[PDB]
Amino acid sequence: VMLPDGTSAYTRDGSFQVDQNGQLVTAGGFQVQPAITIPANALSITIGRDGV
Amino acid sequence: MISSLWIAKTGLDAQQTNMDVIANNLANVSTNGFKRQRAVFEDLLYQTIRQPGAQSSEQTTLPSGLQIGTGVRPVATERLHSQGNLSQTNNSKDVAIKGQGFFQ
Amino acid sequence: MISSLWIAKTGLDAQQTNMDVIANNLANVSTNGFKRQRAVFEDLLYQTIRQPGAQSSEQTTLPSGLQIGTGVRPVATERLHSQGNLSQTNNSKDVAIKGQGFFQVMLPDGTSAYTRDGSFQVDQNGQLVTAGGFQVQPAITIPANALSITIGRDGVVSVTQQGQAAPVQVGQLNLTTFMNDTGLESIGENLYIETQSSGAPNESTPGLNGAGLLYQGYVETSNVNVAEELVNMIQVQRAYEINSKAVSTTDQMLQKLTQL
Amino acid sequence: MISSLWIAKTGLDAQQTNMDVIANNLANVSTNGFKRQRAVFEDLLYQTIRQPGAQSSEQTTLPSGLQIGTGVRPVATERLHSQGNLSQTNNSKDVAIKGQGFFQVMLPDGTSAYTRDGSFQVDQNGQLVTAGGFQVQPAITIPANALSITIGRDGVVSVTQQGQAAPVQVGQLNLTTFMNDTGLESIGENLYIETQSSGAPNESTPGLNGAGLLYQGYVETSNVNVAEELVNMIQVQRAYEINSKAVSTTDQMLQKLTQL
Amino acid sequence: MISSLWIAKTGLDAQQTNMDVIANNLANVSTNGFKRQRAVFEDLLYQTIRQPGAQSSEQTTLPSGLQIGTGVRPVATERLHSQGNLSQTNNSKDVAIKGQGFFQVMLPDGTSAYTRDGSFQVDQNGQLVTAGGFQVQPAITIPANALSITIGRDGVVSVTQQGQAAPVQVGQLNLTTFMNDTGLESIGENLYIETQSSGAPNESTPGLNGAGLLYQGYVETSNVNVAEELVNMIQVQRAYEINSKAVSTTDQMLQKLTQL
Amino acid sequence: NGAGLLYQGYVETSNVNVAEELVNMIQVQRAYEINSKAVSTTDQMLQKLTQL
Amino acid sequence: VMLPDGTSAYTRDGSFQVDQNGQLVTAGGFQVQPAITIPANALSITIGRDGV
Amino acid sequence: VSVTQQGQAAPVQVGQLNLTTFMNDTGLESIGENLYIETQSSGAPNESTPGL
Amino acid sequence: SSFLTLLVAQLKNQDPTNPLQNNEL
Amino acid sequence: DLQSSFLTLLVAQLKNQDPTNPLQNNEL
């Protein structure tokens, strides 16, 4: 996870969200790494056991 | 008292109102000129603890702020004015109505 | 007082908040269009006494330093925006939604709100309101002489006048899609409002741009799983048990400290 | 809270889903063309404590290492496509399929769906639809001057006109077969769209190409035998009760641990 | 603190693990191919005070010396690998196994997994997988024009092709047996992986080399005796009550030792 | 490379064994009890030293 | 904090509150530097993790 | 002591956890950090594998 | 199928904290 | 044989409670 200072922290918490820009952020607005920008129209989100 | 106790109070009140409406419906089977009723519900305040917008840092934004929320206020008991089936009383002094309208 | 009592107090607060969420979810069954709420927790400060790094000697490194930690700060509450079960209500003024999207509404203040409740009404002017006189948007006016109103899965609403053998088209009921459904702020009355966590609203016809479809004669039930709620209730009750036991233990520790 | 509490919560979710699909299946008994939907499960994590290998000496091996395990994650609610019974409606426009086969339907949104229900009709323009504008491929137009309509068991639909005593064929109604009959996804009205999990739909005439036969005057009832699904209900209800018993047992567990 | 409290702590932990095992079994009814679990316990050290031999005088011997002992360490959790009940799922794509044997599977990492689940499915490339794209072994591809897929009790899979009246032999479905079925390390997903205690895998056709037969159209149910699990759960509730009573007694002993 | 898999639609719970915590907390209360008794004994000893 | 005389003090305390002018003061009325003015009819006030 | 790897179906051996026995355990001088140190009264440390 | 829509609808508000026992079902 | 399907279901879940004493003695 990328902190506002630009440093990176690490979390075992899957309570993810999507902000107003489509990025996955984690209950506090922290933008995760690597960036994932969900398209505005998306109907379904799936995350495989390999993470794609 | 306790924040959850008032919410559960509202929940019991709402469900009791729903059951009383249903019991009134089920009591007026075979009552001529009766119309069914249906309770419509609605939730009360949501106390904001963190505003769902309300940026924390210069970059982050804090999605989905924390709101506790209370209550199940019953907003209405709509009376479904649907036309009722007609049956042969064979009585000169009984008239049913097919469609809209009310005797004044 | 003791560093333990503040921690246990934060634990009591966290379990109380989570029980508040459970109670609100539980009480709002049979409320159409209601979205289950789920509280997400997060621990506060860790007051460090020995840094996890901080090499002691020239060869040692002191792995896994000593830091204590406090609190269970409730960081957020998400809202599950999944499709609720439809039920056949057989009323012509109950329209449910299949898929993403919200009806728009004009609040009396002039700003716009949003709602997933189709248990509509017609007021004394014939306009389309929702249980509180809230004019749906764009305004739909039902002519006085109409005998029925049909609201197609495309949102094209038309009425059947008496005499005329045609369903004259009285309007188009369009939905609104937000990028972050969870980010909408709830104001009660089963109404949401715009906030920058949600993003700009995208108004669209039902069916296009990923918006939903409209089902007349259906109502969308609250997606409150009673089983999950009850098991959460059991667990929260027991957690409150345990945390109050912690408070009691620290209190007895302190009282024997005082007696000396 | 307690591990057993989490595991039994997962179990309660799984059995609630079982009973939900059973209740949906009862909801569609005696409704022709319905398939007995079934839920397939899957176990979650196994918390390893001692590895099943874990050589415990120079020579000792320690077979059957200890590991605990959690959860009953349901992967799917798959769609059983099995042969059902046939009932006599005595209608020439109602056709039943015996054996493998799916009815091709051109969806009003422009895609292709399939259904194992042949209660077709004729509209004002002559297109062969079935209760919702379900047009078959290839398009068959019934002549307006037709007197009687007969659909052969081989898939040939024909009409009879006044004067000429010849049953000239007016259209071909062939079936569609799937490599996987289960992977199809429903889009309502018993229509199932082509899916990446169903395999390539092969368009094949009835009688030949290993397809089934067509019965005129008959309708395929749902394969929901009341007896079997009542047996399923009894078993699933027992499972639900025992899982709830495990939840309450963990509750009493913790209560006595706290009255300590 | 007190030796009594440590011994009782181990007892509580042991009963907790037993209840965890029981709850996992209880939740995993109706899960295809699931194998029941049984926990084997094992007492910890015995701290000797007077040695059981240890000649006191030059002729006497002190039989049955004093040693106290601690703990109930759970040594293992074996997995009962007995045949489950087969049920007639009536699907052409579900195959159970009658007797010993596992379907080998190639994981995305490539390492060999094994599953006793016959809910086989077909991906967009037509091959055989198991509910997640787990490409079964050996490589098998169902042709696109295949209609009915039969899995013979010998283990040969053949497809019914387009037009040609022959169920062409399209692949071989052969099992794997281990010397130690109990040793397989479960990794969830109804999958077992080889471990250094299971023994080398032996690949052979179904029905031979001791492996079991393939029953097409059936599914193997979890061999969970519900009543046995209920009795186990009652027993563990009693045992946990008792151990909590032991902890309470030790605590009261300590409390009036200090109040002294 | 040894990393874990991903399970969508799930959240990993805290691995807190509550029974262990309750028994540990009984232990901690009694240990504090004992050490307080030690402080009291030292205090009384130092009493009759001063009273001397 | 700006003392009434004019100099600056420093507090490790946050029991703040807003005076009649909307200034952010500290439980005793001493204005908190730099000056912050909460508007007249604020629905809610939030103070992020970087102090904005 | 051994570990398991990412699919290698056998625990790769990593090392041995030897112990030492002393003629006189009570003679070891304790230095803190729960550490003892060999003295003249403890004798030499007889290294050995556990169980023998 | 009168007492079957009632039976199927009974299995919804099933309340795992106090469900249909085997004896009652 | 339906009696054994429940008479022995009763006395396979009652022939254990009496050992472990969660006794109600009244639903019997």
Binding site: - | - | - | - | - | - | - | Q5, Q8, A10, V12 | - | -
Partner: protein
């Protein structure tokens, strides 16, 4: 390593663990000098290629 073993005369099965830690894949760079003769020798630089921790006392083969 498997290619080298096969060339030397040892054919390791394709499916094997082969988890070794005493070898490191390296790139060797050299400066071909002007008028280089067949029998002459030159200095080389060996640099780790993968994730090797060190090449303290290694041997280039």
């Amino acid at each position: 390593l498997n290619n080298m073993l096969s060339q030397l005369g040892i054919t390791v099965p394709t499916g094997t663990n082969m988890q070794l830690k005493n070898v490191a894949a390296v790139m060797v760079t050299a400066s071909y000098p002007p008028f280089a003769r067949q029998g002459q020798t030159i200095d080389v630089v060996v640099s780790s290629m993968g994730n090797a921790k060190s090449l303290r006392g290694g041997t280039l083969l």
